Amino acid sequence: FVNQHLCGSHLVEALYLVCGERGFFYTDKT
């Protein structure tokens, strides 16, 4: 079951929200 894939889609939205104009990186090394 694609638990990690689904979690990451939520993580990027939450990062978008808190980071604001700072932005963020979301890589293989994040």
Added chain:
Amino acid sequence: GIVEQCCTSICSLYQLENYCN
């Protein structure tokens, strides 16, 4: 990393702010 830290237990926005640029 972030999946390890934040997909195994809940990360608040305060914890996620660590990952901002």
